[PDB]
């Protein structure tokens, strides 16, 4: 882990900024 | 300016990690690169018999430029111009019934190995250009001696690809002017007066000289270091 964990972290942050873009 | 500092790194032997340098001298190349380099190395480490390196004295770039400028005036007809030519000749034999002679007589450079060899044997060639990079060299090693025997002038020139672009091919490996127009026959004469001096008149002395036998850089430095070692007096 820590690698898929970092990738999940960046995926969640990218989804958060992409949905708050609007 | 007061926030920056000069670190400079000690790139000594045990001091710091070396920077990225140009390691092109130490690249492990593929075998095709290695063979295509070591082949030309081996072709000069050996004493080549004079029939080879009767090549390797090529035409200088000025005379090569002017002779290709001459040869480009006499270029074989491409497919499109040949097609409109033959349609014109069909129309001409339809209207006038001319014996396929409405089209004028061609003036084109003759090419193809067997073709120009037969032309040389029949003494119809006025000037022959022989490419220097033929990969079986035995396709053309006999051509200079044959040209000297038949008395036709030859020139060993750089680029079978250049001859190929001259005759609308990829490579041609040989070219020959067999009949020129009166507008530049004098240019052909002043050109051949230097070409024969470069090749034909130097033929019986290049026939005796063995080329090759050239050492590498490290071995050359080693032998001349031994020379200036023996030069104590």
């Amino acid at each position: 882990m820590r690698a898929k964990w970092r990738k999940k972290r960046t995926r969640r942050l990218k989804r958060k900024r992409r949905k708050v873009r609007a | 300016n007061p926030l920056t500092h000069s670190t400079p790194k000690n790139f000594g032997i045990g001091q710091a990690v070396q920077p990225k340098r140009n390691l092109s001298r130490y690249v492990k190349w593929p075998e095709y690169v290695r063979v295509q380099r070591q082949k030309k190395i081996l072709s000069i480490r050996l004493k080549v018999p004079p029939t080879i390196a009767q090549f390797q004295y090529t035409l200088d770039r000025n005379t090569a430029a002017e002779t290709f400028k001459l040869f480009n005036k006499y270029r074989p007809e491409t497919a499109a111009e040949k097609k409109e030519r033959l349609t014109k000749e069909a129309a001409a034999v339809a209207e006038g019934k001319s014996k396929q002679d409405a089209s004028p007589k061609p003036y084109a450079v003759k090419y193809g190995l067997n073709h120009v060899v037969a032309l040389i044997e029949n003494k119809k060639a006025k000037l022959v250009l022989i490419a220097n990079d033929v990969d079986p060299i035995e396709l053309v090693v006999f051509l200079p001696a044959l040209c000297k025997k038949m008395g036709v002038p030859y020139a060993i020139v750089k680029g079978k690809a250049r001859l190929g672009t001259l005759v609308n091919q990829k490579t041609s490996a040989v070219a020959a002017l067999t009949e020129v127009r009166a507008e530049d026959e004098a240019a052909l004469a002043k050109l051949v007066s230097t070409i024969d001096a470069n090749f034909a008149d130097k033929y019986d002395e290049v026939k005796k000289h063995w080329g090759g036998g050239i050492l590498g850089n490290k071995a050359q430095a080693k032998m001349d270091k031994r020379a200036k070692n023996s030069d104590s007096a």
Binding site: - | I13, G14, V17, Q18
Partner: protein, 251 residues
């Protein structure tokens, strides 16, 4: 007749060396640039025991000069090397116990070990416990050093060859009796299947040249020609002499 035991040894089915508990091949550092133009410093992190080997090993850590990383070489530990010690390997290295100076840069009488035959094979000579190579002399012209080997032989190797300064640790091992087939068993159990050994004279003639007879006896002479063939070389191969060695051997 059958295929005899020493003839079977070369197939390497059950006669391979048991290499499960070995730390790796104990080689010298590669002669890259630093070792032949200056020196480089490593550190002995741990001195460990190697299975099937009488001499202890030393895990020396160097820095890679071209990439940011750490390289770990396995040296054979010389007698006196301790943990935390700085090992200096190179042409400009100082003459101390544990350093890997080339043999061209050491004076006569220097005691070295793990010596290269040709520069770049990373240690071939004097690697057993307690052994060492003496430097007899140099030849600057025709750059060769003459050395005395543990066998008493005198070799002439390149002065660019390297060697660890000192004596291989673990010396005096064979001065202790094993006292026991069990101890010999446990010694060979981690080297290879070469123990116990049945005498060929106690076998049958299908099994050995010496086998057979109503008494245990060899029969023919036990000295075998060097030009003999496999299956015949059972005995003293190409013996120049035999019997008890009295007097000096005229070495």
């Amino acid at each position: 007749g059958r295929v005899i035991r020493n003839q079977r040894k070369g197939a390497g089915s059950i006669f391979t060396s048991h290499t499960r508990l070995r730390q790796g091949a104990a080689k010298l550092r590669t002669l890259d640039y630093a070792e032949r133009h200056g020196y480089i410093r490593g550190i002995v992190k741990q001195i460990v025991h190697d299975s099937g080997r009488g001499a202890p090993l030393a895990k020396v850590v160097f820095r890679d000069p071209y990439k940011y990383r750490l390289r770990e070489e396995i040296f054979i530990a010389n007698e006196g090397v301790h943990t935390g010690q700085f090992i200096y390997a190179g042409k400009k290295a100082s003459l101390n116990v544990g350093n890997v100076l080339p043999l061209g840069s050491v004076p006569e009488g220097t005691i070295v070990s793990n010596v290269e035959e040709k520069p770049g094979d990373r240690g071939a000579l004097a690697r057993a416990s307690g052994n060492y190579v003496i430097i007899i002399g140099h030849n600057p012209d025709e750059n060769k050093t003459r050395v005395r080997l543990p066998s008493g032989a005198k070799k002439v190797i390149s002065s660019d060859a390297r060697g660890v300064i000192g004596v291989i640790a673990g010396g005096g091992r064979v001065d202790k009796p094993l006292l026991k087939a069990g101890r010999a068993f446990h010694k060979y159990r981690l080297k290879r299947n070469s123990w116990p050994k049945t005498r060929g004279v106690a076998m049958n003639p299908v099994d050995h040249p010496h086998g057979g007879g109503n008494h245990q006896h060899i029969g023919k002479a036990s000295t075998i020609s060097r030009g003999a063939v496999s299956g015949q070389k059972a005995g003293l191969i190409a013996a120049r002499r035999t019997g008890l060695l009295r007097g000096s051997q005229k070495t």
